[PDB]
Every structure is written in C-alpha cells, then in structure tokens.
C-alpha cells in the first residue's frame, strides 16, 4: 500500500520508524495512520458522489520521524522525470502531487511547510501540535486537523481544576515538544491558580541505549525529588520512546502514589503498557483526540521511485499489536482521515463535479489551498472546517490507563470541546487510593475560619494558617491573607472570625 496512480495524486509523509528507513526502529503508529489515509482515499473512490473519475492516488514516503523530512518534498512538486524547474513565479506549475498530507512530527511538519511556502502547495498534518504552526504568515500552506498544544494544555488544566489539584509537578523533555508544551502549561496555570512545584527536564534517552553514568545519577535525582515533593500530580511532556527509561526507575524507586497526566504524545502509545507493573505507579491519565472508528477500517487493517519509501516488518508488527490497536480503537487515524477528506472535498468542488461528472480542468496547488481553506461537510457525524488559523476543531479527550488485557486499554474519561473551551462528561475514573477517593494534591490545607492564610514561599498556593491574635477577626469579607481588628464595641479573641 505505497503507490496508486490517478488523475490527481496526493502524498503522505508517514513515520513508519524511529530511533533506507528500515534501519530505524519500527513504529507501529506510522503504519496505522498510513492505513487510515488508505481507507480515506479508497472510500472516496468507492463513494462516486465525492469524486466520479479523477481518482486520487497516494504517494507515501516514510519520513523516518525527524530524519527524512526534506527529500520527500523535493520528490513531490517535481515532474515525473524527477526534475523540478525553478522560476520566480510558480503560479503556472503542474505538480503531480496536489497537496502533501500528513507529516507527523512538528519539526518535520515545519521543515515541509518551509519547503512548501514557495509553491503554496497545501500540507495537512494529522498530529502536529506545536502552537507556532497557527501563524499563517510563515506557513500559509499548513492547514491542520487536530487541536493545537494550547487546547491540550487547557484540557489538562481544566481537568486539574475539576479535581482540585492546585499543586502539580511538570516534567518536560529536551526537545521542542517538551520545552514549548511545558512553557504553555506553566503560563496557563499561572492564571488559573494552579502552581507548579518544580520542573525537571527528562534526559533524552533511547530504548536501545544502555544508559550512561551521569544520566543515571540525574534520573535518580529526579525520582528522589518526585518522592520528596508533596505534589502528587506529575505532568510529563515527552515523546513516547523517551519515557521508558525514566518510568523504569520511577517504578523501581517504589514511588507509589501519583497521577500522571500524560501528554498527547504518549497518552495513547501502547509501548509503555508492556511494563505490566505500572499500576504500582498510580492512575495514569492522558490527553488525546477520540473519534468513532472508521466503519470499515477492520477490513483494511486485517487484510493480507523514492528513497526510504518502503518498510520491511511493519505489517507483521501491526498485526501482532492489532489486539491493542483494535481494542484501543485507534483514534488519531480520524485526523488523517479528515485531512484526506478535506483535500478530497476541496479538489472535488474545485473541479465542480455536481454529482454528475468531473471536468478535469488544470489544477494548481495554490488554487487547492484557496479552496481548502473553507470546507463545511459532515464526515462520520463531525463538521470539518478550519478556523482562520488553519486548525479544525476536533474533540480532545482524556484517557485513563486500564491495564486489564480484556478490552479498552485506553478509557475515554473526559471530553473536551475545542470551541466551547470547556470540559464535560468526566466518567467516574478509577484511582490508586485506598477508597477510590480523588488523590488530593495541595501544598497546604485550606485555612480554617478565624485563621489568616499568610502566604509562604514563592507560589500563591502555599500558606500557613496563623490564628490572628485576640481582638482581631478574620475579615474574610475583604481580605484573607491578613487579619484585621474588628472595630466598635465588638472585640474578638483567638480565632472566632465572627467578632462579637
């Protein structure tokens, strides 16, 4: 499933590996998303209404995560003879691929978008999250079909507001996905009264690596801080293949109580599950985009010219993990599904096929951009349309990690509405506590009446409760951080906010 001809082609920059592209470590999710695009265009062809004739033909080139990000684009927007003429005016250019679709990593997305801004050829990404992609002056041709980092951050922060976690820990990675996301979280929580305890950069390590010395000491220090700090909500921002090592010695350190709000990167990744003793670490939570599975995806999932554009062991690995992928109900596939359908509808209406026939008038990438920046259609009971900043509104979701092998390794706990910017349908979530109670994470218990909540330390979430002296009452009406004296005949005593 790596080539199909058509009157108008399209291209997919899927990430089949990580860590030729076969030399890198096989990644299942790349193959999953590719099969998603596959079903997209296959059904588009079957559905004669969407595009009679003028069939689309995918052209996939494995991007090798962040390694192969430039050559696939060069191959794209080049004539059949692998030759790309250069002109100051690109208006008149016949491009075989009309809109590349689905660079995965944010860095690869940015490289492709920079390479494409010359040609104004649409690029629709299914997983890019970086907030910088919202600025349509540097990336005019970077439509996107999944909510940005801002929305995941708001979802998590509103989750912690609902469960009353005003004292949280956040650990970031050493890449952009870590630093930028942790920054966004910090800036958000600054204005919603959630206070960051301490921030620690999780060292960049590989699953195949055998660790080093200084890095081992650094992670030991990190987990010691984790088990020290009273804050028991740890929000980890990191690619999937980075957590493994850190989680290992987190577990080994007998660090029991916690609530790991997982970033979108590893909120749906099934690699960390095989640790099979993560229950001891505590309730794992994550943020993702949940959608009904494509109705027929089972058929294509289970069915039996460019550099580094083929894989070797992806099919067998995908079928092996199919237990989890089907049970988990892959959902980020609908992002690429909707991207493909957006390109398909823009291309259809541009050719003006009125359910009767298609006029195969010459099309250019920039015309497709002009047409694709405005689409309103219902795809599997979902309205697909881009906001002016080129990001459709798909529902982010919260996933708790159920270890039971039976079914649903990811449980849809909270639904986040992008436009509404709110959190709803918080299904009763299991907890690691002794009575299923909500694990409290506060710097200090709220001060009682008659006690002043004098701030202590940096953050406004920490206070120690002085009982202001006799003749002084806790003027909770006006100020709480200070105790004042009740005037007139009223004369209070220790505590006793109600001054007599």
């Amino acid at each position: 499933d790596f080539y199909l001809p058509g009157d108008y082609l399209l291209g997919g920059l899927f990430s089949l590996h990580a860590n030729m592209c076969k030399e890198y470590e096989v990644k299942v999710i790349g193959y999953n998303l590719m099969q998603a695009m596959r079903f997209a265009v296959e059904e588009i062809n079957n559905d004669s209404s969407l595009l009679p004739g003028v069939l689309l033909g995918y052209e996939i080139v494995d991007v090798c995560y962040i390694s192969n990000n430039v050559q696939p684009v060069l191959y794209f927007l080049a004539h059949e003879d692998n030759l790309l003429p250069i002109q100051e005016d690109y208006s008149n250019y016949i491009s075989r691929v009309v809109a590349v679709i689905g660079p995965d990593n944010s860095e690869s997305v940015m490289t492709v978008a920079n390479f494409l801004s010359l040609f104004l050829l649409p690029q629709i990404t299914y997983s890019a999250i970086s907030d910088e992609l919202r600025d349509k002056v540097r990336f005019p041709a970077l439509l996107r079909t999944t909510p940005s980092a801002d929305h995941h951050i708001e979802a998590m922060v509103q989750l912690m507001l609902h469960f009353r976690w005003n004292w949280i820990i956040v650990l970031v990675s050493s890449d952009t996905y870590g630093r930028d996301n942790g920054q966004l979280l910090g800036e958000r929580v600054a204005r919603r009264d959630i206070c960051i305890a301490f921030q620690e950069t999780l060292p960049t390590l590989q699953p195949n690596q055998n660790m080093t010395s200084e890095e081992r000491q650094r992670l030991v220090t990190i987990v010691d801080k984790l088990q020290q700090s009273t804050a028991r909500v740890v929000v980890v921002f990191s690619p999937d293949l980075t957590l493994y090592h850190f989680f290992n010695e987190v577990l080994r350190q007998n660090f029991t109580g916690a609530v790991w709000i997982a970033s979108e990167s590893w909120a749906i990744d099934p690699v960390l599950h095989n640790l099979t003793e993560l229950r001891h670490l505590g309730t794992f939570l994550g943020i993702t985009i949940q959608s009904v599975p494509i109705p027929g995806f089972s058929e294509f999932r289970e069915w039996g010219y460019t550099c580094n554009q083929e894989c070797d062991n992806c099919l067998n690995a995908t079928l092996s993990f199919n237990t989890i992928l089907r049970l988990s109900g892959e959902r980020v596939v609908y992002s690429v599904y909707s991207a493909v359908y957006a390109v398909a509808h823009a291309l259809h209406s541009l050719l003006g096929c009125d359910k009767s026939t298609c006029t195969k008038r010459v099309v250019y990438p920039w015309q497709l951009l002009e047409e694709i920046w405005k689409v309103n259609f219902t795809l599997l009971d979902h309205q697909i349309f881009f906001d002016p900043q080129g990001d459709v509104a798909l529902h982010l979701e919260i996933v708790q990690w159920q270890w039971d092998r039976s079914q649903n390794p990811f449980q849809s706990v909270a639904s986040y509405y992008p436009l509404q910017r709110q959190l709803k349908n918080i299904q009763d979530i299991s907890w690691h506590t002794i009575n299923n109670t909500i694990p409290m994470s506060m710097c200090s218990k709220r001060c009682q009446s008659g006690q002043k909540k004098k701030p202590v330390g940096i953050h406004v979430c920490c206070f120690e409760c002085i009982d202001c002296l006799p003749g002084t009452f806790l003027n909770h009406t006006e100020d709480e951080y200070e105790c004042q004296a009740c005037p007139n005949n009223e004369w209070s005593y220790q505590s006793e906010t109600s001054c007599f």
Partner: protein
C-alpha cells in the same frame, strides 16, 4: 546611479553561495498570499549590503593571493534573504540546481549530483539558518554561516554540514554559569526573551546551571514589545515575581527589544536594583542605554565576543562606492537582489553607518574557511593543484570538519560539532553619568577569570550583591523546598513546643505540656 547589481556575481571557477539581507522585506504584503511567489524586497538594508561587500572583499583577497587556491578562482553568488524563508529559500534551490541548468533533480541519492556552488555562506538569521540547514543536510553542502548562534545547529544530527562562525549561545551561557558559580550566585532568577532566541538560551541555561550547582528561582520569559498591552501586564508580572523571589541576579538572555521593554517598564515603576548578567545582544546596545533614569538598575555585566577587527573594510566600501560610479568600469563588467535602478541607487551616505562592524569579519572568516577547505580537498600546494576532477560538496564536508584556517592571523578552527573556538570578555557597564561605558573585567576561555576588583556593584560600599540558596543546611532546621528546580531549600527553625517528628517533614509538630521543647528542637524532651 551607483552600479552594483552587475558586480554582485563573478564567474570564477568554484562558485560560493551567499544569502545576505541586502534588502529587508516591508511589513505590508507578507500576510496576503494568493499567488505562489516570494514578495519583492525593494527596500534597502545597509548592513546587508555591507556584508555582501565583505564577502566580495574576501573572495577578491583570496583570488589576488597566490598561496590559496593557486590557479583557481571562486565566484560570488550573492542572493537576498530579507530575513524571511519564503524569499530566502528559492535561492537555496538555485544553489543545487545544476551546472548551468536551472532545474533541480529529486534523485534518491546525492553522490552523482554535481551542484552549481560548493559552500553556501549561510544566512544571518538563525531561523533562516534552521531552514537552510535542513535543506542542505540532505545534499551535504557545506554551509558556513556568519550570524547563527542558536545551539540547536551544533551536532551532526540534523545539520551535518553547518560549520558556522559566531560561536553558539552555548559558550557564552557556559561563561555566564561560571560567572554565577565563582561569584557565589546560585539563587539566580534567569530570564529570557519570549521569542525562540530566549527560549533556547533559557533551556541551555537550565541544563548548564543545574550542572554548575546554581539552581533557578524563576525561569521566565519577557515578551518582545510589538504592541504590548497584555504583554505589558506580562512584563509587570515577570518583574514582580523576580522581585518577590528575593534575588539579586537576573541573567537576561533576551533580544535587544525585549530588554528595552523590560528596562522601560522597570524604570517606569522604579523596580529594585539588581545584577543583570547580559547577553551579547544588549551588552552593547544604544536602545537600552538611551532610556532616561536607567542607570539605577544595579550593575550590568555580561560577555562579549572577542572578534578581531577586520580593518580596511570602510576603505573597501568607499573604494567600491567611488569605483562603481565610473560608467566605463561596470559597463565592461556587465559585458541577484537589490538589482532595480533604485535598488542600486545608493550613496556613501546611505551606507556609511555600520562600516566597522564585527560581522564583516565573520563573513570574511566563512569565505576563508571554505577557501581553505577547498585547498585541503583539492590537494593544491604552493602555485599548483592537480584539479583532476570537479569537487562535490560532500568532499568539503569530509575535509571541513576539524579544519583550522588562518584568518587575519587568528588560527580559527572548526570544532567537531561545527562551531568555532573564540574567547569572550566580561564587559561591565560602569556609569560616569548618562553613558555606561564598557571595559574588560574578566576574559572567558572556558575557564572564566574575572578581576573582582573592577566592579562597582552599586548598593553601598560596593559589596557584591549576595544571592544564595541554602543547600543542605543544618540539622537544627526544617526544610522547605523552593525553586523552579527543587535544588536547595529554605531553612526554617522549629518553634517552641513544635518538635520535628522526623528530619524530613514540612513542619514541626507540637507536643503536650508533659515535655519541654524549645525552638530548633526535633524531639520533645521532658
């Protein structure tokens, strides 16, 4: 009118690329893009043209010189960048099209490629550095830059060939961390600009400072001004938290404009004085200097680049301005950006501002680095070279890593990552009244040596502003964790009666009257 478009290129033999900001894009038509193209750059940026003349002087000097590339010439390929990737990338595609042919192939490999140029003198902008580096990584084209400073362009990971000049922010940030370490500062509240420059600087400094034992108190970002409003409120909040963290050093790794906004607001609110370990971006800047009432903001001292002045550059610019005026001269030469008659209609007055700039030498050094890289890869000796076959750029890549080239008598050598090894200097903003002159206090060579006797330190009796975090303090006190990184804590003494049940609690626990327990007492004693 002055005639320079014709002379922005020479045939030579081995052409070298050039991406300089000769003209900077107007902020009018960038947003509107309904036609695939790059917006024209009709405006004139004097510093960019100074840099272009610097590259031309470099190439002319090697061409005239006999020892370097004997019987061989290098050709210019000046192109504009406008500090915008869209209008700075298609030149990059031109640089790999072909020998003469304007079409660029999309082969799977690159070994059979025979590109137009050899090494592309990288863009000044670090964002353009990223874009062009991602482009030339696939083709393995040497790209020695002259403005890039973000540490991300260091390793042979995604930028295998980015042998830049202008040592990265990593070296000056190591220098600043060493400054804080020797000066006893560990409760430092590092700060950076909201743009990517400050972000990368502050990530680097988080790692470095943690390694050095000096742990942050508030890692915050100060927005660049643009239209501030809510960003002005953010600035207010940032300085408020800086003050309320009770520090005396704020390493500000912020661009010039963010620093101007920060200092403007601070003076406008009479914020408390403190030390500002500065970047090279505003250690020498008129913008922050010219704010009235700014002098009472502590002592400002940072690290500056010790780049040997490349003299005779103003002479060369004047000579070219005079020489291009002769109709016969460049008419024969005629027989690239800034090509329109108005674009080339500059004068000595319009360009006589930068002149003795510290980056014309950077461009010189890049050109000479590629010159010596060729000299090594083409096995030329004095007055000869076999020159059997054309050289592909990857051969330079092989022979550009770990290359030492003599420029202006300075034996600059490319480190394994790609950067260059140059020392810095501790410029101190001493105030004689309304003009903070800079002078040497300490020189950084990887081991910062500072003359402690050359800093005024403001305050009274010039005592060094002490900013200390009590790490691992006495057993008679209870520990409260403070800091963006939990490194170190604040010691709090136990109160009467409150016996510290264990030495790892957040407070001291009270006991009954049966036992007598004074302050700083862990166990209630009868």
């Amino acid at each position: 009118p002055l005639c320079l478009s014709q002379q922005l290129r020479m045939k030579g033999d081995y052409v070298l690329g050039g991406l300089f900001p000769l003209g900077e894009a107007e902020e009018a038509g960038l947003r509107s893009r309904t036609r695939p193209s790059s917006p024209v750059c009709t405006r004139f940026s004097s510093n960019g043209l100074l840099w272009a003349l610097a590259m031309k002087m470099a190439v002319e000097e090697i061409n005239n010189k006999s020892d370097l590339l004997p019987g061989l010439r290098l050709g210019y390929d000046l192109f504009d960048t406008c500090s915008e990737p869209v209008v700075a990338m298609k030149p990059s595609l031109m640089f790999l099209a072909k020998a003469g042919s304007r079409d660029i192939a999309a082969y799977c490999n690159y070994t059979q490629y025979q590109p137009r140029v050899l090494a592309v003198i990288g863009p000044h902008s670090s964002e353009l550095a990223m874009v062009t580096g991602k482009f030339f990584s696939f083709f393995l084209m040497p790209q020695v830059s002259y403005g890039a400073s973000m540490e991300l362009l260091s390793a042979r990971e995604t930028f295998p060939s980015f042998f830049r000049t202008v040592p990265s922010d990593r070296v000056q940030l190591t220098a600043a961390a060493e400054l804080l370490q020797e000066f006893g500062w560990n409760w430092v509240a590092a700060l950076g600009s909201d743009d990517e420059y400050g972000r990368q600087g502050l990530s680097i400094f988080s790692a470095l400072a943690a390694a050095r034992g000096i742990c942050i108190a508030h890692e915050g970002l100060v927005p660049l001004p643009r239209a501030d409003d809510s960003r002005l409120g953010k600035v207010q909040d940032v300085l408020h938290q800086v003050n309320q963290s009770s520090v005396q050093v704020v390493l500000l790794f912020a661009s010039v404009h963010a620093a101007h906004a920060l200092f403007n607001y601070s003076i406008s609110s009479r914020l408390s004085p403190k030390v500002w370990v500065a970047s090279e971006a505003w250690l020498t800047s008129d913008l922050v200097m010219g704010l009235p009432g700014m002098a009472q903001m502590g002592t400002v001292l940072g690290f500056l680049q010790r780049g040997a002045q490349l003299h005779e550059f103003p002479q060369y610019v004047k000579t070219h301005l005079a020489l291009a005026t002769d109709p016969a001269f460049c008419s024969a030469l005629g027989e690239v950006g800034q090509r329109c008659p108005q674009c080339d209609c500059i004068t000595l007055q319009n360009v006589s501002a930068g002149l003795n700039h510290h980056q014309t030498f950077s461009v010189y050094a890049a050109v000479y680095s590629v010159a010596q890289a060729l000299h090594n890869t083409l096995q030329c000796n004095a007055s000869g070279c076999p020159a059997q076959d054309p050289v592909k750029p990857w051969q330079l890549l092989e022979n550009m890593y770990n290359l030492t080239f003599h420029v202006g008598g300075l034996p600059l050598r490319f480190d394994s990552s790609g950067n260059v090894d140059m020392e810095y200097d501790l410029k101190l903003w001493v105030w004689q009244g309304s003009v903070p002159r800079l002078h040497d206090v300490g020189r950084f060579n990887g081991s910062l040596r500072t003359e402690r006797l050359k800093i005024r330190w403001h305050t009274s009796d010039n005592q060094k502003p002490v900013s200390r975090c009590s790490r691992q303090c006495q057993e008679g006190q209870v520990r409260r964790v403070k800091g963006f990184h939990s490194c170190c804590y604040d010691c709090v003494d136990c109160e009467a009666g409150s016996y510290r049940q264990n030495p790892d609690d957040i407070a001291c626990t009270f006991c009954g009257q049966d036992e007598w327990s004074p302050e700083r007492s862990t166990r209630c004693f009868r």
